[PDB]
């Protein structure tokens with residue numbers, strides 16, 4: 001086709017978006033993205049790259065306020081897509097100078113492959129190498145979690161940053177319309193249920209994400225023996241739900257921000273929380289009609305529907321800039337949308353790091369008198385929290401037990417913050433809880449004879465309690481129980497050693513073969529479950545290799561899980577003697593076979 | 603290798619590559635199916651799963667298969683029925699076709715469940731695991747091709763209610779197979795049967811390709 005530089009100035013645009021699409025996902029992203037520009041300041045066009053003459057790239061800065069964007073999918077072992085071939089090889093063997101050219105890239109990928117967004121990474125790197133300048137972070141979409149979610153996140157924060165570098169700024173364009181139903185009948189207003197109206201009152205199965213069951217809290221005891229943190233065991237009765245579960249399974253939970261916290265926002269925002277209302281999605285052919293169950297109050301929303309705790313995203317701060325009367329105040333808000341410079345430096349420091357929630361922002365920015373309805377547009381939905389079930393359905397058919405740490409801490413915000421679910425959970429005294437049961441493939445093996453290694457430092461001991469219960473049960477049934485190992489860990493023996501007595505009972509009952517306990521602050525050198533493993537290596541090896549033992553790692557993911565993995569690698573490497581790298585292969589094979597299974601979080 | 607799961611992949615490595623490069627599959631992978639084309643295959647599959655799941659039900663308690671019984675997490679019959687209702691309307695019942703390839707496959711299934719239970723697992727390995735690997739991409743190509751609702755109607759067979767992570771589930775499934783007690787003679791039989799099952803699928807794909815472009 002006739003050159004794209006010409007066709008931009010001819011069709012009246014500044015922004016251009018190229019898509020490398022195989023199955024049309026990249027295209028989908030590209031098209032939505034250039035259509036965002038149109039009502040966000042500028043005006044974009046999405047194009048198939050194979051039909052335009054790509055030498056014309058350093059000819060882009062001839063269009064004033066120009067930016068170029070790339071949406072490319074990673075295929076195979078990190079290789080390119082169809083319509084992207086001409087470009088790719090040119091890029092590989094060019095180095096003619098791109099100084100002054102503005103760009104940004106989004107990668108479409110999957111974490112189960114070891115070439116994660118290799119395509120996207122390449123393109124993003126290469127352009128910089130030629131003299132060109134990046135405006136926004138390279139996106140790393142992931143199909144293992146949810147690629148779409150990763151995209152939407154990235155997109156949410158792109159536009160605000162783009163605006164700030166260039167100036168532009170309609171910086172305000174709405175997506176919902178407020179419709180007060182000021183005089184309206186009572187039982188057609190949502191009170192915080194998740195699915196249908198009065199779903200929380202009319203409880204019949206199916207019970208799930210959209211019709212939670214409300215389980216009655218049978219008890220709550222502080223397992224925490226010290227004072228450092230509060231760690232708690234709760235018992236949720238699911239008697240007539242006829243929900244089934246298996247040990248190691250999750251139970252998901254629908255919490256409510258502490259109403260006290262709620263109220264402050266309402267106050268300082270200065271509206272009536274109890275105002276019955278709806279926000280209607282005005283983009284008519286969007287069947288996503290309200291951001292949350294409507295009709296309902298602001299009270300009901302802030303308490304049950306919206307996420308008022310996890311700090312703001314960049315975009316919402318940019319949105320809010322407009323309600324600040326103070327110029328200086330406005331400026332700060334405007335800055336924290338920049339994807340780089342000082343602007344990015346600040347935001348990470350004073351928002352995300354300091355864990356300034358919505359409320360804190362308002363408190364720290366007096367000018368912010370934004371409308372409550374518009375805020376109830378800009379807030380993320382309250383995500384449910386899930387908990388590894390700490391019971392066995394064979395000993396507790398009618399009860400789902402949870403183990404958890406309650407969250408609470410001095411941030412750099414000066415503000416003491418609270419955990420939503422955990423604080424909420426804590427207040428539930430022996431009071432109903434909306435929850436469902438989601439399946440995991442964290443499971444005990446079929447052969448009761450199969451030995452088990454359980455590694456569960458901290459609350460990670462949770463699902464493993466269920467495991468232990470099940471093993472105990474087996475022995476009551478006269479079935480042959482294999483070797484059963486718990487490698488647990490905590491800070492100090494008298495402080496936070498979860499289920500001390502019951503675990504010990506299990507020890508002496510024969511049900512738990514070895515109770516190994518890593519006490520980490522009982523000396524000035526730290527003692528971890530890896531250490532314990534190292535100590536026992538030979539015993540472990542015979543179990544894994546002769547007994548055909550299963551491996552379970554539950555708990556902290558950042559450090560612990562992969563330290564444990566490394567320890568296992570070393571065990572393999574020395575005992576059916578291998579190259580380190582051979583050992584890793586063996587380990588990996590184990591996982592595939594389904595003999596090494598995890599269940600972590602942060 | 604030693605473990606059933608490891609063995610089967612190696613034994614069907616060849617067959618898989620040929621199944622996936624048959625004309626129907628390759629075309630499908632670039633997004634080239636007709637509504638009739640899609641309609642046919644689903645119909646055929648319905649019969650297969652009805653037979654398979656009947657046999658499973660029969661032998662859910664025999665230890666040559668009991669460790670591979672996943673009614674909650676896998677069973678496809680109800681889901682397939684939904685898709686038949688969507689694709690062939692309220693009359694789907696005897697409206698759906700019943701190709702020769704399909705028939706042969708089903709009758710083999712009957713035999714296997716009838717006198718060779720120990721081998722069921724080969725069929726199961728071929729089927730369910732496939733659905734959790736290729737299946738997810740295949741579902742999503744359907745939207746581009748037939749542009750169906752992200753309300754999900756017509757793609758119940760490709761949607762897995764109970765299974766939160768297909769990668770995770772494959773994990774467990776493989777372990778489950780290993781838990782079956784079998785002599786390596788019987789292991790070899792099972793491996794052979796896996797190949798047979800693959801062949802059965804492959805024959806279907808090429809049949810239906812004839813009848814489309816036609």
Ligand SMILES: Cc1cc2nc3c(=O)[nH]c(=O)nc-3n(C[C@H](O)[C@H](O)[C@H](O)COP(=O)(O)OP(=O)(O)OC[C@H]3O[C@@H](n4cnc5c(N)ncnc54)[C@H](O)[C@@H]3O)c2cc1C
Pocket residue numbers: 250309355385386387388389403404405407408409411418419420421422423459462463599600601602
């Ligand atoms: C599959 C899965 C299974 C899980 N199982 C369990 C389980 O069995 N038991 C269990 O306790 N948890 C479990 N979790 C984690 C759990 O769901 C929650 O993350 C946790 O319980 C806190 O929820 P909350 O709403 O109470 O706290 P939130 O209100 O969500 O706030 C907690 C968040 O604030 C931040 N934070 C906390 N302390 C600090 C600090 N000092 N400085 C800065 N930031 C901080 C972190 O982002 C933290 O995740 C699991 C998670 C997953 C994904």
Ligand code: HEM
Pocket residue numbers: 611618621622627631727728729730731732733735736772803
């Ligand atoms: C659309 C083309 C297909 C592609 C690209 C494809 C690709 C793959 C891949 C990459 C795996 C490995 C999964 C993993 O990484 O864990 C796999 C597994 C599998 N596939 Fe396919 N597949 C296709 C179609 C089919 C077909 C037609 C069948 C048979 C009906 C099938 C049956 C299986 C089975 C049974 C497994 C499990 C193998 C194992 O245990 O590792 N697939 N496929």
Ligand SMILES: Cc1cc2nc3c(=O)[nH]c(=O)nc-3n(C[C@H](O)[C@H](O)[C@H](O)COP(=O)(O)O)c2cc1C
Pocket residue numbers: 020021022023024025026027073074075076077078108109110111113114115116117118143147739
């Ligand atoms: C056969 C195949 C192989 C893939 N390999 C990788 C990979 O190695 N690394 C990665 O990050 N993503 C990988 N992906 C993820 C794709 O990029 C992802 O599915 C993307 O959404 C497809 O985009 P498209 O529909 O626009 O082509 C792979 C996808 C497929 C279908």
